[PDB]
Amino acid sequence: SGFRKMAFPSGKVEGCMVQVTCGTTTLNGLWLDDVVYCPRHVICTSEDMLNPNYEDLLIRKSNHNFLVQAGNVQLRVIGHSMQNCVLKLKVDTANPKTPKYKFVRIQPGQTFSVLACYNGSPSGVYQCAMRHNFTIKGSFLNGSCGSVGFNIDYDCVSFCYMHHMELPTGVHAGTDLEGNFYGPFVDRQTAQAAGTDTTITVNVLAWLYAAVINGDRWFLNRFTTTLNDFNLVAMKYNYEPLTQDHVDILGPLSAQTGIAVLDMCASLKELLQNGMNGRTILGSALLEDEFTPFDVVRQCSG
Amino acid sequence: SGFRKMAFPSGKVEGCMVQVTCGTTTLNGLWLDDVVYCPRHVICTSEDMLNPNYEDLLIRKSNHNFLVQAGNVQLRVIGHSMQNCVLKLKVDTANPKTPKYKFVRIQPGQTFSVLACYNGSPSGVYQCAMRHNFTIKGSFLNGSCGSVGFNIDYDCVSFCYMHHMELPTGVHAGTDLEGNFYGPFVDRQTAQAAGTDTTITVNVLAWLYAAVINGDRWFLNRFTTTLNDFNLVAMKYNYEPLTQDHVDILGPLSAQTGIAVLDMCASLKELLQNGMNGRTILGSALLEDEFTPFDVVRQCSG
Ligand SMILES: Cn1cc2cc(/N=c3\[nH]c(=O)n(-c4cncc(O[C@H]5CCOC5)c4)c(=O)n3Cc3cc(F)c(F)cc3F)c(Cl)cc2n1
Numbered sequence: 001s002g003f004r005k006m007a008f009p010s011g012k013v014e015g016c017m018v019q020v021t022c023g024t025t026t027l028n029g030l031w032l033d034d035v036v037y038c039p040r041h042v043i044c045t046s047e048d049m050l051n052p053n054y055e056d057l058l059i060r061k062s063n064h065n066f067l068v069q070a071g072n073v074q075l076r077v078i079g080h081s082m083q084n085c086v087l088k089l090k091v092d093t094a095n096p097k098t099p100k101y102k103f104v105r106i107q108p109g110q111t112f113s114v115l116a117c118y119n120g121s122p123s124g125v126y127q128c129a130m131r132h133n134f135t136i137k138g139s140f141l142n143g144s145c146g147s148v149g150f151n152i153d154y155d156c157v158s159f160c161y162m163h164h165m166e167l168p169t170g171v172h173a174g175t176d177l178e179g180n181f182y183g184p185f186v187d188r189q190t191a192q193a194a195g196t197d198t199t200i201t202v203n204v205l206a207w208l209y210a211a212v213i214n215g216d217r218w219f220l221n222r223f224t225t226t227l228n229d230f231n232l233v234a235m236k237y238n239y240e241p242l243t244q245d246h247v248d249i250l251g252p253l254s255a256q257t258g259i260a261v262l263d264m265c266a267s268l269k270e271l272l273q274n275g276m277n278g279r280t281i282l283g284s285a286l287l288e289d290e291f292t293p294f295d296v297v298r299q300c301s302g
Numbered sequence: 303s304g305f306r307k308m309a310f311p312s313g314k315v316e317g318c319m320v321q322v323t324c325g326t327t328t329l330n331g332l333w334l335d336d337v338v339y340c341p342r343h344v345i346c347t348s349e350d351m352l353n354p355n356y357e358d359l360l361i362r363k364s365n366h367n368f369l370v371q372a373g374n375v376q377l378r379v380i381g382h383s384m385q386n387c388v389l390k391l392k393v394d395t396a397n398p399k400t401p402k403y404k405f406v407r408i409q410p411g412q413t414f415s416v417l418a419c420y421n422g423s424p425s426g427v428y429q430c431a432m433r434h435n436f437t438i439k440g441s442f443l444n445g446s447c448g449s450v451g452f453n454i455d456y457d458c459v460s461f462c463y464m465h466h467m468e469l470p471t472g473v474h475a476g477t478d479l480e481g482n483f484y485g486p487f488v489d490r491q492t493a494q495a496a497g498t499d500t501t502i503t504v505n506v507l508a509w510l511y512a513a514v515i516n517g518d519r520w521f522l523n524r525f526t527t528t529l530n531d532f533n534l535v536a537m538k539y540n541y542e543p544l545t546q547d548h549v550d551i552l553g554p555l556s557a558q559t560g561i562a563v564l565d566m567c568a569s570l571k572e573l574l575q576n577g578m579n580g581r582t583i584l585g586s587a588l589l590e591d592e593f594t595p596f597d598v599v600r601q602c603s604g
């Protein structure tokens with residue numbers, strides 16, 4: 001037992017990370033087969049970063065303007081192209097460490113692992129969720145641009161996030177691997193603000209099930225509630241509405257614990273209206289909303 | 303910016319994980335050069351697990367009794383030996399993925415990454431600290447025996463923990479890679495209890511510095527305190543005593559933020575005596591003690 005914020009093992013992604021430099025601008029890239037993927041922002045000089053026209057900037061470049069370093073090896077660029085906010089640099093060598101992989105876009109409330117990298121060198125791995133306002137509460141320093149987020153299903157790395165930038169509130173914004181931003185953001189060094197965020201209700205419930213599986217039961221109660229009378233109370237506290245599909249997704253956890261979903265909702269209603277009275281759940285003093293039903297099952301059952 | 307529980311990238315360790323089977327008993331091993339390291343508990347049958355005499359059990363075995371699987375390859379055991387609670391299985395093939403590595407024993411309050419593995423297959427990575435009572439609050443299921451904890455310094459993996467078992471309270475116990483247990487535990491399937499734990503004070507202070515670096519300042523105050531009048535108040539709340547060496551270790555964070563260590567201690571004293579009044583620090587509603595001064599610097603400065 002026990003419950004941690006667990007990331008996927010990151011080795012399959014580490015063997016893909018490279019450094020990309022254009023001029024004095026540098027950041028991380030992702031090398032899969034004979035293509036290197038990276039934020040197109042790398043073709044911006046310091047004075048270009050404020051208000052770039054990327055089509056203009058890219059036509060003024062050739063392959064020899066891009067320096068790609070894979071460890072101690074320089075990869076020669078033999079082709080370049082833009083796809084939305086990602087640059088694709090064709091190289092003359094296919095990555096021998098390419099894993100089976102997929103480019104998938106994720107939904108708010110889903111989780112993924114991040115491999116934070118600097119100058120093409122992996123430095124750390126952590127688990128994050130995509131918030132309702134399409135930001136993530138990441139941990140990143142200067143140089144982290146191009147770090148990727150991913151999930152692993154069996155042997156296949158599903159890449160879902162490429163990091164681009166930090167917003168003024170300190171949260172992080174980026175794109176899927178086809179270069180399409182998550183949320184209403186653009187890749188220019190201007191102040192941009194995220195919309196309002198909500199608590200991911202289904203995840204909180206999933207985490208309450210995790211707690212029960214691990215012997216934390218103090219928040220349970222004999223009451224029950226209706227799906228509508230719960231949402232009426234959850235909106236008040238800035239929680240996403242619960243749907244019948246969320247209850248279905250929570251089915252398996254309901255079974256393993258024998259606690260009907262709507263019953264667990266009753267406990268959540270009480271926790272929101274009374275607080276925790278100085279107690280904790282799974283070692284935390286607030287309600288955690290960055291574990292999905294699937295993450296719970298993976299860690300608490302097998 | 304931002305602050306997460308970050309693990310080291312785990313690839314260098316993933317390429318070392320194997321499965322070891324003796325009879326119907328199976329668990330994880332660590333393959334470095336031509337040796338596989340694993341808990342000696344693997345030579346126990348179900349009825350041996352309660353009260354084993356390992357010297358007896360091992361003399362009754364030969365090399366052919368040990369099945370080592372590295373992915374789809376079986377490694378032939380050509381030698382076996384015991385070192386304290388670890389079995390060393392000599393194999394006829396050196397691991398081509400062996401990283402530079404060291405066996406180091408860590409201290410209570412230090413942190414490390416865990417690669418949780420099942421049947422020799424890595425499943426997840428998380429960051430943990432060694433508690434004052436020499437347990438860790440891990441996340442592990444059946445089959446996780448032999449998973450390793452480690453730190454990476456540059457290119458060198460310092461292995462510090464091999465997982466052995468879960469205690470009745472749900473916390474986890476194991477050994478260093480020389481087979482010496484952390485804490486007063488033994489590798490037999492009997493109920494054993496950990497001693498009392500304390501909060502790792504220097505880490506809490508390190509984390510308060512992280513919070514300041516990230517713009518969380520509400521807990522600060524103009525007061526200061528003396529090292530002795532802080533400890534007098536911290537003991538009351540089950541905190542480790544602070545030493546002059548802890549203040550020195552916290553020096554760099556003191557400098558980067560301009561907040562004298564004893565001043566930050568003043569804020570901690572106040573938080574312990576008043577609580578947090580429904581506010582949070584770095585997204586948490588309680589004081590976090592599993593980040594060391596070094597982890598903070600690594601994530602908050604570079
Ligand atoms: C020499 N050189 C200089 C370069 C500067 C660059 N710019 C960024 N580098 C970067 O790392 N971070 C960043 C991400 N996460 C956390 C962060 O935390 C820091 C900040 C406060 O705390 C610690 C920072 C950014 O935000 N940017 C801006 C930015 C990047 C984009 F891709 C974009 F489309 C629009 C932008 F506005 C790049 Cl990409 C390459 C460079 N080479």
Ligand SMILES: Cn1cc2cc(/N=c3\[nH]c(=O)n(-c4cncc(O[C@H]5CCOC5)c4)c(=O)n3Cc3cc(F)c(F)cc3F)c(Cl)cc2n1
Pocket residue numbers: 001326327328329341343344442443444445446447465466467468474488489490491492
């Ligand atoms: C067929 N087979 C059967 C086997 C059984 C085995 N025994 C253990 N396997 C194991 O995984 N965990 C465990 C660790 N962490 C978290 C855990 O969580 C579970 C428990 C509740 O929640 C989910 C469990 C253990 O505690 N043990 C006991 C144990 C192991 C030792 F090394 C020891 F020295 C003394 C012991 F008392 C082994 Cl090692 C190999 C086997 N092959």
